[PDB]
Amino acid sequence: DVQRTIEVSVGPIVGLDYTLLYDTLPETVSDNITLPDLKDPERVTEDTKKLILKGCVYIAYHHPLETDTLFIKVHKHIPEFCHSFLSHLLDDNALIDIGLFFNMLQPSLGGWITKNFLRHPNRMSKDQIKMLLDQIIKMAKEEYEKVWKKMPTYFESIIQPLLH
Numbered sequence: 001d002v003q004r005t006i007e008v009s010v011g012p013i014v015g016l017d018y019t020l021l022y023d024t025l026p027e028t029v030s031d032n033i034t035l036p037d038l039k040d041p042e043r044v045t046e047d048t049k050k051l052i053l054k055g056c057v058y059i060a061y062h063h064p065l066e067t068d069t070l071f072i073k074v075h076k077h078i079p080e081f082c083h084s085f086l087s088h089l090l091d092d093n094a095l096i097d098i099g100l101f102f103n104m105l106q107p108s109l110g111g112w113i114t115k116n117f118l119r120h121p122n123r124m125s126k127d128q129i130k131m132l133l134d135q136i137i138k139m140a141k142e143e144y145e146k147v148w149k150k151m152p153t154y155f156e157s158i159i160q161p162l163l164h
Contacts, residue, residue: 011039017073029055041088049089057133079156086152097146122161129162
């Protein structure tokens, strides 16, 4: 029975417990996917990728104490898990154009978003970080070369302060 649990809990992201992830995601997400979907972004539709990513942002916002086993086995690995799903949805030389991305955000977050916040996401509040990550998922489908090509890692850098 040890092998039965290894089979289900272990997947592509090292250290992530896929059974605890499936259990922790909101039912609005888990009503629409299975645990094997979490292990294989390529077999998931674009819209279901976005639904999983939005769920990850939600449980990152509502994370448990960082000493809990659940945090170590799930939340600690959400940045890498989101990087994977984002890469599939959408290079060590390319950069992230903060100035273009700031303009892209004006219709949705222009009332409060600042260049400072985009350079230093750990300076945002938890509510702001959540709003930025949710907005990135909403927009995801020139700008590709400058912003979207680097977004999987930039998104990873934004959600990490949400976890603490």
